Structures are given as C-alpha cells and as structure tokens.
Amino acid sequence: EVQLVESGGGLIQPGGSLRLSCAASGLTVSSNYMHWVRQAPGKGLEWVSVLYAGGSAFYADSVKGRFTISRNNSKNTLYLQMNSLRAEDTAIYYCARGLGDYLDSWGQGTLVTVSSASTKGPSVFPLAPSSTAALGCLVKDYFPEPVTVSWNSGALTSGVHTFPAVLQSSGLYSLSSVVTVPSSSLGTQTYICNVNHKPSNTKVDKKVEPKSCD
Amino acid sequence: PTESIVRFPNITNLCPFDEVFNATRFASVYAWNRKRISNCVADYSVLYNLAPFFTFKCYGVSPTKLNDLCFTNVYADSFVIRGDEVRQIAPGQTGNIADYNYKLPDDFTGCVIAWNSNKLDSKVSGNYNYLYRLFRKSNLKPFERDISTEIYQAGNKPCNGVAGFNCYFPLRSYSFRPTYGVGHQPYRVVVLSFELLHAPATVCGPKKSTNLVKNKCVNFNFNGLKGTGVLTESNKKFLPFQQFGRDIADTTDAVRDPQTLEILDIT
Amino acid sequence: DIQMTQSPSSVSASVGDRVTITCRASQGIGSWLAWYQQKPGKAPQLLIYAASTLQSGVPPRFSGSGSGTDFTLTITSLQPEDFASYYCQQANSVLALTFGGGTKVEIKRTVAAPSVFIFPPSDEQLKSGTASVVCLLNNFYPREAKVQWKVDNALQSGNSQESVTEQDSKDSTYSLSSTLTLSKADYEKHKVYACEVTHQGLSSPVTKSFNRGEC
Amino acid sequence: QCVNLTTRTQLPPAYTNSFTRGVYYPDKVFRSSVLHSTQDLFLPFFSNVTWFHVIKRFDNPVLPFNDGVYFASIEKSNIIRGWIFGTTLDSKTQSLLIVNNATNVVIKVCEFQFCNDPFLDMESEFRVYSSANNCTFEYVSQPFLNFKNLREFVFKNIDGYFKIYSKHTPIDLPQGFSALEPLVDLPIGINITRFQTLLALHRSGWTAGAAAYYVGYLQPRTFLLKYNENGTITDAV
Ligand SMILES: *[C@@H]1O[C@H](CO)[C@@H](O)[C@H](O)[C@H]1NC(C)=O
Ligand SMILES: *[C@@H]1O[C@H](CO)[C@@H](O)[C@H](O)[C@H]1NC(C)=O
Ligand SMILES: *[C@@H]1O[C@H](CO)[C@@H](O)[C@H](O)[C@H]1NC(C)=O
Ligand SMILES: *[C@@H]1O[C@H](CO)[C@@H](O)[C@H](O)[C@H]1NC(C)=O
Ligand SMILES: *[C@@H]1O[C@H](CO)[C@@H](O)[C@H](O)[C@H]1NC(C)=O
Ligand SMILES: *[C@@H]1O[C@H](CO)[C@@H](O)[C@H](O)[C@H]1NC(C)=O
Ligand SMILES: *[C@@H]1O[C@H](CO)[C@@H](O)[C@H](O)[C@H]1NC(C)=O
C-alpha cells in the first residue's frame, strides 16, 4: 500500500540548482523519519541526508554544506534544496521512509547527470573482421545516456552482447556492441547497424563488410 | 602577622549526593526521575578529587567558583546514557535524544556528570531493562517529562492500539552487552540543574577553620566581621544563640565561635 | 568515524549451497545490523532487521545471526530469482546510515577460456583525428582476465577501459570489451597491436598480433 | 477534607489592653549595659488587643495580615497546634503551613485546598488538607513546646524571612515583662494576607476546654531599652 514517486531529475550544469520531489501516498512526511540514499554507478550505496519527524536535519561528512531539506504539509511532498555540485555528485537516489536503524519502504529512481558539455550526435565506427568470427560496431562521442542498438531492425537477437556505457578521461561516453557471425554467412546476409536515441534524434544507417585489401 | 580565616560553624547535614551517584538502579531515559536537593551544604570538591568522570564540559559556571556562588535549589536527573548520546547533551545539539527524549535551554545553568558504567547495568546477554522515546509528532518542551503508552501512528489511518502496519510502539529497548564498543558502552549520567530565584538560597556549601592564636596582635575575621586585636578569654559569660557583642561606640568587644563557645575578647 | 568492510566480494554457488556472506565489523556492534538486496535496474528491498528477526513479506529461507562482532547471511535454499547483491547496514546514534561494499552471487561455470578477436581500425576513422583499436574476450571464468596491451614488445597501462556485459537468463555468458585511445601521430610510430590474457583454461596464453597496413 | 460546622454561636469581639508585653529582642547582635533606640516593628504600649475565647464556642475569624501579628495565648494540654498563611488558601496560590502533632514539628510549604473550618481531632485525625502538588522548602525542626502554661509568639516578615520568636512562661492578660528569644529563621518569601490558626477539638459530639488567644498589630515606633550586666532585657519606656 506504500508507493513513492520521484521526479525533477535530469541533466544540469555543475554550477546550477535542481528541484527534488518525493511524494508519499500512504505516508505523511511530518510524522515519521525520512531517509535519503545515494548510489554512484560501479559501486555500492551511500548516505547523504536524514530528515527527522521534527525540525532536525543531518548530513554526512562530505555533504555537511551545500544541502538543505525542507518538508511541506500542503501536498505531502518533500523538497530538497541544492545549490552546488561536484564531479562525483552524479548518481542514483531513492528517497524512502523507515524506522530507526532500518528502513523498509523504497521508491523509484530518477537519473541525474552533471557535465560541462551538452548533447552531441553519435558516430558509428565500423569494425573490419579478420580474414568462428565476431562482428559489431563501435559507438563514440554520444550524448546523453542512454542509447540503444539494433541489429537488422531487431530481426537478429542471437549472440547480442550490449556492453554497458563507460566514461573516459575526457568526460565523454563510449559504447561497444558485438555479435557472433559464421564464416559461411559473410556474403549471404547483410546486417545493418542502427544506433539512435531520442534526445539527439539522429537517424544513421551503417553496413559492415569484411576487408578485402585494407 | 598572619591572617586567621573565618570560623564558620561545624559541618551541617550533607546533601544526599551519595545515594544519587551510587544508587543500585537508575531510572529510564523517558521516565527520568526528578529529585530536588536543598537544606544542606554542597561540596563538589570531594567528588572532583577522586575524578571518576570523563565529561566535565560546563557553560556559564566554573568549578573554582562553585563553592562561592550558590542558587535557590538543585535538581537532579539520573538516567543511563551511552557516550555517543552523552556528547549530545549540549544545548546546541540535535537528534533523537536532544529533541524527543530530553531538552536543554540555551540559558541553562550548570552541566551534567557522566562516568563509565560498563561493569553495571549489564548481564551475560542483552539487557532490556531500559527504554527510550523514539517517535514524536513535535519537539519536546524543555524541563518536562511525558510518559505516553499509546501506540504511535505514522500512516493516514488510525489504529486502535494494534501492532499492524503504519503504526508501532514508539518506545524501543536497549541492548547492553560487554562485547560492545567504546562508543556503545552504557554510561551513567546525572544532570546537575541550577535555578536562581528571588527567594534567598538554602543550599550554598560548607567552610573550614584554622588553628587558634592567643596572646598575639593578629587580625581576625569572625562571621564576616573584620577587625584587629588580641584574642584572649575572659569572664564575660553570655547568653546563648548569639553571634557577637558590641559596646557604646559600636566597636566589637566579644565574639563566640561555633566550635568551643569561648569568650574571645577583641581588644 | 566507523568504517565497515565486507570480506566476500564474488562467491560462486549452486542452488544447493550456502552463500556464507559475512560483514566484518571494526568496532563492537551486535544485533543492530540489517541486510538489503537490490536487483540490477530495480529498487532495493529490506530482507532482515536487527540481524535476528525476519520480515513478514520476506520468505523464511533467509537466516541471520550474530552476537557481538560477526554476522552471517546463510540461506537454506537458493533460487534463480534470488541472485543479487547484499549490503550490511549499521546506523549511528544520530541515525547516520553507513553502506559498505557489495557481494555478488553467481554459479560455478568455468566452461571455456576467452578468445581474442582483434579488429583493425577503419579507414574512415583516420579522418576523425583519433584512432582506436579494440579486442574482445568472451565466455571467461573467473573475473580475473588481464586486458593489457603489448605494443612493440612494451607494456602499456592505463589506456583500456574494461566493460563487462550483463547476464542472460538462459546461458549466463560474460563478455569483456576494452577501447584503447591513441593519437593519430602515435599510430605511425608503432607497427603492431595485440592484447594478452592469462587464463586457467588455456595451458599457454594466445597472442594475436597484426601488423600495420596489412595482415 | 473537612466537615462543615453549623452550631457556631455569634459573639462580637472584645478588646483588652496590653501592658508592656510586646517587647522582644531587636536583633541577633548581643548588647548589654547600654541604652539604645532602634527603628523596627514593635507593638505600641497602651494599645488595644482583640479578645477571643474558645470553650460551646467555636471561633476562627478572618483578619488581614497588614503587618506582623502579635499572638499571645493562654493554653492548657496543647489546645492549638499551628497557623496557616495564604492569600486565598486554594490551589492557585502558595500557602504556608505549621503543624505540631504529639511527636515533632514539620514545616512544609505547599499548595492545598483549604476549607472554611480547618481543625484537628488521642491524635489520629488530620483534617487540615486534601492533597498536595509541586512545592519546595520542606523543613523539620524540634518541638516548640487552673491555667499554668502561657505561650507567646511573634511573627515577622522582612526580606522574605519568616522570623518567629517564642517564649514559654508559667502563670485576662496578667501584668509583667517577658523576652521573646529568636528561635528559627525561615527564608520562604511569599505574599502575606492572612494568619489563620488551627484548633484541636477532643472527640468523645465534641467538647473542648477553656482556651483563649490574643491578636495584635505591630507598628514602626521608637522604644528605649535598658539592658542588664547579666545580658537580659529590663523594662522599656
Ligand atoms: C560511590 O562509591 C564509591 C566507591 O566507594 C566512592 O568512591 C564514591 O565516593 C561514592 N560516591 C559518592 C558521591 O560518595
Ligand atoms: C564541632 O565538631 C568538633 C569536632 O567533632 C566537636 O569537638 C565540637 O564539639 C563540635 N561543636 C558542636 C557545637 O557540636
Ligand atoms: C481599641 O478599639 C476599641 C474598638 O475598636 C476601642 O473601643 C478602644 O478605645 C480602642 N483602644 C484605644 C486605646 O483607643
Ligand atoms: C507527626 O509529625 C511528624 C513531623 O512533625 C511527621 O513526621 C509525622 O508523620 C506526623 N505524624 C502523623 C501521624 O501525622
Ligand atoms: C510546578 O511543577 C513544575 C514541575 O513539576 C515545576 O517546574 C514548577 O517549578 C512548579 N511550580 C512551583 C510554583 O513550585
Ligand atoms: C507579593 O505581592 C506583590 C504585589 O501584591 C508582588 O509584586 C510580589 O511579587 C509578591 N511576592 C512574591 C514573592 O511573589
Ligand atoms: C549574673 O551572673 C552572675 C554570674 O553567673 C550570677 O551570679 C548572678 O546571679 C546573675 N544575676 C542574676 C540577676 O541572675
């Protein structure tokens, strides 16, 4: 009977502000303890703030400043105040309710990303197979997360290995995805490489051929 | 040559600090006992000389001037508090203890006394003899105690004392074991409260005396009266329950100390 | 102040086995630990609280006990749906939550050894100003697989980023992909490219070295 | 908790003059063989003192405590026990209580729901109060005690101090002189309006013996005192 709705997340500049909303359906925000959790990709959970049933607010050692909580009883929705950001501040968060020393309720997750760049079109890089076999595409300089890849407009589903996104030292996204093909079907069927995403609305089609001279 | 200190009367009844600091059982955190101490003499030097306490942070008062200034009444609150929560006893602190269990005003006079009690208030297993308030709908008012056995509710629907969802028992039990860490060790904390009113004080403290000087021109100080002369006995037998004598020219000529009740002529 | 560490990192077990997941405590905290389980892409859920009790919604297959310093998460029966990370959580007197590392539970497979399949850079990548070469590893167990690149018989480090794909429901196959970044001026300095891995399934490492400009 | 009385007989108060009875010790400082005048609260000589008699007569009137009261009484077999002082004698004000039973004397100042006839009834019945509440300053002291016993009490309230002077001597008001020695100082500091007393009636309805008491007012007058070489106080002017 408990459900929590999260909104307000998105891509914002590090020198900006964001609005966080945590809506409780069967819970009242001014009668029980409030818990906030954070989880950077590639690692585990971490704690950022806890709001008590009264006018008491607590924060962790790394986030003593630049963070303020404020609840409202007008619509039973929690508001979080933020003014400053860091390079590692991008993560996933789940506002939740619980008792002391343990929490049982949980909510959904809205991704937040901080970067100095903006949305940029991708560039599909073909791969030349060596003359079993492996075939795939290289995705470089695509913004923002996430992206999807389809083989033969979704007809090919066997051997698909969609690797997760990885961040480079320059703060750009690179992704790879390869499939398994046999040597007897190199000149039999042609596979089209489709990479697209909603924010950039790019429509690019790429075909792959085994190398003949180069 | 030298100075003779004031010869105040003998040591009167002592304040019951022995039973407060060495009781066989202390009150609960939420049901903290309220005790008033008055009509005695306060001596904090004897407790400080042994020094079994690890907390002596006090605001507005000093240990050196505790024997000089005094207040109308003394209030004592004794209840077991772990060291993490102890460091939270300051008025400029927030949390579950500072807002749902106990409250201290910004202009609070005095401080609290805490000492290690790992040997007592524990057994081979977890001790569940102490409880504390955890959930409340509002900030706790200072200098008051509320004991509510009703089931705390958090959900929109109200529950009639049942243990269902969205409402549970606000009180929670402690877990005191010898295997716990230093910060989780159970300490015994007593609150020393000072209140000053327009009425005259009844508890301030005792005083000591010195050795007798006879047949010498030594200045004296008897019950706050300053003068110079030679202390010598005489035959001036006086009626009891008096302090000192006088003469025509208001000069003090006789004073009795509440140690031997002698003549002690001034000049 | 308080730091919590988890001794297990990746344990492999079948359905008829005990995970024996434990959480190491630097200080003495007993009967005040809770375990949480989260799925990939899903919200976490509570499993047990106070290290002794069991939640009503949680099935009773989960068991946990600990007196003062050591806790366990032995499970009577392991299910394919119940395969997720576990975290030990300890709170403070000011309700300061602390979360440590996570341990992932899998099944012993060790079916084969990784196969190296290198790919020369495309001709269109030359006009982009950056040249990248990748090599792939597939169906390898365990997670120990060095993806170092040896060019001109010289060791290279801090240039390839590891990427591990997700698990499918039928085969549970793991793959590794690494992207190497080099400037266009540095491509003409070198003459081959190769990546080397060490695995227990192969008696000797397999190195595929292709020269620049042809096979 | 108390029982209301109805058979009280109305009787107008009488006045009997006092003959050099209100002289008491001026201060804690002892002086002797000297002549001095002080500016304190004293009972003027040749004044009028209201006469009250209790025998079937039951009297407990209400008079204002404008200044210190002079309480003299002839007493046998401990007829009276103590006095109560309060603005309205209820739970919304602080009141002082003095109770002396057959064992000891306890001074306890708390708030009580006093009724219009608070009296006492062997001694195993205390109908003087119903219940108590928050208070402080609880003190326990030594007992203060043909007609043969005469007890004289002086009540003063300066700088919040409830100074009481008592003197017991053996024997209307006879002619003579007496000295009121200082016994107990009580720093209580409460508003002063009334000086209602307590009476004890033996139960056999009830029959009480002969008893009387005197009430007077103190005024800031000047008196000359002649002292003795022994240290006692002689007759004044
Ligand atoms: C409590 O007992 C100990 C043990 O003898 C003693 O040292 C201490 O002085 C006692 N406390 C007080 C207030 O006397
Ligand atoms: C005061 O104490 C001393 C030491 O015990 C004793 O000799 C003396 O008699 C006492 N004085 C009174 C008045 O009790
Ligand atoms: C005292 O008062 C009574 C009545 O109030 C009066 O008759 C009497 O004369 C007064 N005494 C003096 C000395 O005036
Ligand atoms: C008698 O008075 C003493 C103190 O004055 C008190 O302790 C005791 O309880 C009283 N007895 C009764 C029966 O009220
Ligand atoms: C009334 O009681 C409260 C708490 O019991 C106390 O703080 C307060 O001082 C009391 N008031 C008086 C006038 O004694
Ligand atoms: C006595 O009454 C006066 C005014 O009637 C008031 O100002 C004063 O505070 C009262 N005394 C006490 C101790 O409250
Ligand atoms: C005064 O004191 C002396 C010495 O004790 C005594 O002999 C004499 O009787 C006293 N005088 C009176 C009037 O009691």
- The span from the CA of A212 to the CA of B160, in Å, is 82
CB contacts under 8 A, C 53-92 vs A, are 55, 85, 87, 89, 91
B248 touches chain D (CB under 8 A): yes
R_g over Cα of chain B = 26
Residues C99, C143 share a domain: no
Cα–Cα distances in angstroms (integers) from residue B87 to residues A64, B4, B81, C93, C147, in the given order: 19, 44, 10, 11, 51
Q: How far is D59 from chain B (nearest CA, A)?
A: 34
Chains D and C touch (3+ CB pairs under 8 A): no
Q: DSSP secondary-structure letter at C40?
A: T
Same domain, C119 and C99: no
Give residue D98 CA to ligand 4 midpoint distance, Å: 12
Per the omega criterion (within 30 degrees of 0), is the bond before A164 cis?
Answer: no
Chain D touched by B202 (CB under 8 Å): yes
Q: What is the DSSP letter of C15?
A: S
The reply to whether A117 touches chain C by the CB within 8 Å rule is: no
Neighbours of B, requiring at least 3 CB pairs below 8 Å, are A, C, D
Domains and CATH numbers, chain A: 3-114 (2.60.40.10), 123-208 (2.60.40.10)
- Do both C161 and C176 map to the same domain? yes
Range of the domain at C204: 112-211
Cβ neighbours of B96 in C, within 8 Å: 93-95
The answer on C123 and C95 residing in a single domain is no
C182 pairs with which residues across the strands?
Answer: C131
Contact B96 A52 (CB under 8 A): yes
Cα–chain-centroid distance for residue C131?
Answer: 28
CA B56 to each of CA B90, B181, B189: distance values in angstroms, whole numbers, following the listed order: 12, 22, 12
Please check whether residues C87 and C138 belong to one and the same domain.
Answer: no
> The domain that contains C85 carries what CATH number?
2.60.40.10
User: D106 CB under 6 A from ligand 4?
Assistant: yes
Task: Inspect the interface and report whether the beta carbons of B97 and C93 lie closer than 8 Å.
Answer: yes
Q: Are residues C25 and C75 in the same domain?
A: yes
Enter the DSSP assignment of B32.
-
Chains in contact with chain A (at least 3 beta-carbon pairs closer than 8 A): B, C
Q: Are residues C155 and C74 in the same domain?
A: no
Please report the DSSP string for A28-56 in residue order. -TTSS-EEEEEE-TTS-EEEEEEE-SSS-
How far apart CA A56 and CA B139 sit, in angstroms, is: 9
**Boundary (domain end) residue, out of C84, C106, C128:** C106
Asked if C108 and C12 count as a contact pair (C-beta separation under 8 A), the reply is yes
Experimental technique, in short, is cryo-EM
Of the residues C106, C122, C145, the one at which a domain ends: C106
Given CB atoms, is B126 within the 8 Å cutoff of chain C?
A: yes
Could you list the beta-strand ranges (E) of chain D: 14-17, 35-39, 48-54, 69-74, 80-86, 95-100, 105-109, 119-120, 136-141, 150-158, 161-169, 181-184, 196-200, 202-203, 206-207, 211-217, 222-226
Instruction: Give the residue extent of every domain in chain B.
Output: 17-195, 212-267
Distance of alpha carbon C170 from alpha carbon B103, whole angstroms: 60
Distance CA B230, CA B216 (A): 5
List chain C residues with CB under 8 Å of A58: 94-96
**Residue D203: DSSP 8-state:** E
Distances (CA, A) of B256 to B259, D176, D191: 9, 32, 36
- CB contacts, 8 Å: B248 with chain D: 34
Q: Is C64 exposed, middle or buried (0-12, 13-18, 19+ CB in 10 A)?
A: buried
Closest by CA position to D54, among listed D86, D13, D18, D97 = D13
The alpha carbon of residue B266 and the mean position of all alpha carbons in its chain are separated, in whole angstroms, by: 40
The CATH topology of domain B17-195 is: Alpha-Beta Plaits (3.30.70)
Q: Using only C-alpha atoms, what is the Rg of chain A?
A: 23
Q: Confirm if B33 and B79 have CB atoms less than 8 A apart.
A: yes
Radius of gyration of chain C (CA): 23
User: Could you report how far apart the first and last alpha carbons of chain B are, in Å?
Assistant: 16
Domain boundary residue, one of C89, C106, C123: C106
Provide the pairing of β-strand A204-207 with D95-100. Answer: unpaired
How many folded domains does chain C comprise?
A: 2
Cis peptide before D182 (omega within 30 of 0): no
Cα–Cα distance list, D9 to B198, D53, D56, D58, D172 (Å): 44, 12, 8, 7, 21
Resolution for this experimental structure (Å): 4.7
* Cα-based distances in Å from B97 to A124, B132, B151, B152: 60, 9, 19, 17
Domains with residue ranges and CATH for chain D: 16-220 (2.60.120)
Give the gap in angstroms from C-alpha C205 to the nearest C-alpha of chain A. 19
| Cα distance between residue A46 and residue C165, in whole Å | 24
Q: How many residues does this entry show for chain C?
A: 215
